[PDB]
Amino acid sequence: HSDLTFCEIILMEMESHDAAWPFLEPVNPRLVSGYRRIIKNPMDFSTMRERLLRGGYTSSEEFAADALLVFDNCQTFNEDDSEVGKAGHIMRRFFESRWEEFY
Ligand SMILES: CCOC(=O)c1cn(C)c(=O)cc1Cl
C-alpha cells in the first residue's frame, strides 16, 4: 500500500510543478509535426493519473517506468536547449530526486 501511496504523492507533486506544463496532457500530434513518427510510446501525467486512479499499477516500478518514459520521450523529441527540453530536464531531475529519497 505504501508503495502506491508514494506514487500518488509524487504524481501530485509533478502535476503541480512549475515545469510540468509540457507533460500534463497527451501531446497533440496534429499540432506537433513529426511527433507521431518519432515517439513510439507516448506518455504523460494525465495518462499516468488515469491508470493510477483506476488501480492499474501493480508495483511502484511500473509507475516509475511510465514517469521515465515521459522524460525519455521528451529528450528524444526535443532539443536540450528548447523550452520543452529545459522543462523536461527540470522535471526529470525532480522525479529522480523525489523517488530516491524514499526508496
Ligand atoms: C503543452 C504543449 O506542450 C508541447 O507543445 C509539447 C510537449 N511535449 C511533451 C513534447 O514532447 C513536445 C511539445 Cl511541442
Curated annotation (Swiss-Prot):
This is Bromodomain adjacent to zinc finger domain protein 2A. Component of the NoRC-1 ISWI chromatin remodeling complex at least composed of SMARCA1 and BAZ2A/TIP5, which regulates the spacing of histone octamers on the DNA template to facilitate access to DNA. Within the NoRC-1 ISWI chromatin remodeling complex interacts with SMARCA1; the interaction is direct. Component of the NoRC-5 ISWI chromatin remodeling complex (also called the NoRC nucleolar-remodeling complex), at least composed of SMARCA5/SNF2H and BAZ2A/TIP5, which regulates the spacing of histone octamers on the DNA template to facilitate access to DNA. The bromo domain and the PHD-type zinc finger recognize and bind histone H4 acetylated on 'Lys-16' (H4K16ac). These 2 domains play a central role in the recruitment of chromatin silencing proteins such as DNMT1, DNMT3B and HDAC1. Expressed at moderate levels in most tissues analyzed, including heart, brain, placenta, lung, skeletal muscle, kidney and pancreas. Regulatory subunit of the ATP-dependent NoRC-1 and NoRC-5 ISWI chromatin remodeling complexes, which form ordered nucleosome arrays on chromatin and facilitate access to DNA during DNA-templated processes such as DNA replication, transcription, and repair. Both complexes regulate the spacing of nucleosomes along the chromatin and have the ability to slide mononucleosomes to the center of a DNA template. Directly stimulates the ATPase activity of SMARCA5 in the NoRC-5 ISWI chromatin remodeling complex. Deacetylation by SIRT1 in late S phase enhances pRNA-binding, allowing de novo DNA methylation and heterochromatin formation. Acetylation is high during S phase and declines to background levels in late S phase when the silent copies of rRNA genes are replicated. Ubiquitinated. Deubiquitinated by USP21 leading to its stabilization. Belongs to the WAL family. It is found in: Nucleus, Nucleolus.
